[PDB]
């Protein structure tokens, strides 16, 4: 199936299993603490994390792979999906995090928790990155998915698992080249612009990294409440 | 496992 | 104006052919195998004789020496440890199942045990080779990918200049799938395969720091001042 | 900083 699917098909696909965004608690009025800030961020991100494993389903070629497979893709992936799909909502607000319609930071904000601050300046770069680009929603689809299916596949007859998995990313690549073709680009230029995009994912593995430990650093601070979900997705990377 | 589970079901 | 955007693709291939650094040896003492202790001391020292050829690598990747010298301080100390792994990596491709550090010094995953919390990044090390091999990866793209990590690691957390290089880099790996016969679709395909690799590259880079941390941190070996700034780059 | 004299020398 998943094989089977054209560029076009592939990104209304696509397209077609975008998760919805969320609205966190934030009230304007109530006033921020350490732990607060906090908790609505893990609150929101466990939310979002439901979607993503339902949003994972939906994604071409994910469910063919075996349950011990889907469960190792999320655990590896599950912060660069979530980062990636903040500097996307971020885009059009230069400086500025949405994590929420109704919960935008800046920099100053992220400072309420200790650490938090180079995440936040990570992230905005990004953003500030995508923007000039002009990234388009129908590249940014791929890349989530990109994401989704290559940022483990190298860490899990388990190998017939494997060809699969690369197989379904040349389609994803596939994909992006007929966006680009499409959106009128020269031969050169749709190689340049495939190759900016690909980079994109290297600092954002990065982010997740570098998040993934700050998220250890509140779990043992004992702030912050950490979700089930939460606590064992960061369970996943040890650390 | 809460994410094998949602996988699941 | 930089004069790397104005060579051509063969120039920049062999340019950066020309540019790489030598494959050093590591202590010859046949009788070490192996602590924890003598273990990260023949690494460390690997390390720190292998980051001071580095340095001078990347003076003659063109584009590099037309940043200020903050700008290269800073892509260095991001891309320091990515750059030692692809080597690594690059090196062990033709030994399956194995790391060359040095042509003396051949390690396999049941070492990797010797020190703690090594065997994870060992393995990695290893799958990453495995596919470098299965992707017959030349060594002409090798030393593109290899500039591609120094140029880019470190560019996002600082700008146009290092993007057109990166750019220029770009055309030069297809250049050279093209010159090897690969048809369109295997030309983007072959580029994005590449490119994901580095997303792991840097994974194991985060990874690695983070271990190199705790070494230090125990106080087994002493590590040299200059792999010491590297590390405390890292915060 | 080493990396400083190094990147001169
Ligand atoms: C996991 C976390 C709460 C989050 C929540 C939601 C989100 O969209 C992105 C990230 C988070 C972790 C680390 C961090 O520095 C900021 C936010
Ligand atoms: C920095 C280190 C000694 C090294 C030395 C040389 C090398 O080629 C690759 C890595 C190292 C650090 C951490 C690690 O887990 C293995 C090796």
Redesign the pocket.
């Known amino acids: 199936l998943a094989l089977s699917l054209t560029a076009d098909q592939m990104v209304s696909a696509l397209l077609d299993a975008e998760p919805p965004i969320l609205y966190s608690e934030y009230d304007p009025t109530r006033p921020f603490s350490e732990a607060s800030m ?1 908790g609505l ?2 609150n ?2 466990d939310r ?1 994390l439901v979607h993503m494993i339902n949003w994972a389903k939906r994604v071409p070629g994910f469910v063919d792979l075996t349950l011990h497979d889907q469960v190792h893709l999320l655990e590896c992936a599950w ?1 660069e999906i ?2 990636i ?2 500097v996307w909502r971020s885009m059009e607000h230069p400086g500025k995090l949405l ?1 929420a319609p109704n919960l935008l930071l800046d920099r100053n904000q992220g400072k309420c ?1 200790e650490g ?1 601050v180079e ?2 300046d990570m992230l905005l770069a990004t953003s500030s990155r995508f923007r000039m680009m002009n990234l388009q929603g129908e590249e940014f689809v791929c890349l989530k998915s990109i994401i989704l299916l290559n940022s483990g596949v190298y860490t899990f007859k388990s190998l017939e698992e494997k060809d699969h998995i690369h197989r379904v990313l040349d389609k994803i690549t596939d994909t992006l080249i007929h966006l680009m073709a499409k959106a009128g680009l020269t031969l050169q230029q749709q190689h340049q612009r495939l190759a900016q995009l690909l980079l994109i994912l290297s600092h954002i593995r990065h982010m997740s990294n570098k ?1 993934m430990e ?2 250890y650093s509140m779990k043992c601070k004992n702030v912050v409440p950490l979700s089930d979900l939460l606590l064992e997705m960061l369970d996943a990377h040890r650390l | 496992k809460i994410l094998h589970r949602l996988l699941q079901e």
């Open positions: 906090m961020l893990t929101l991100a979002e912060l979530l980062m799909g903040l994590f928790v938090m995440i936040f998040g700050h998220l």
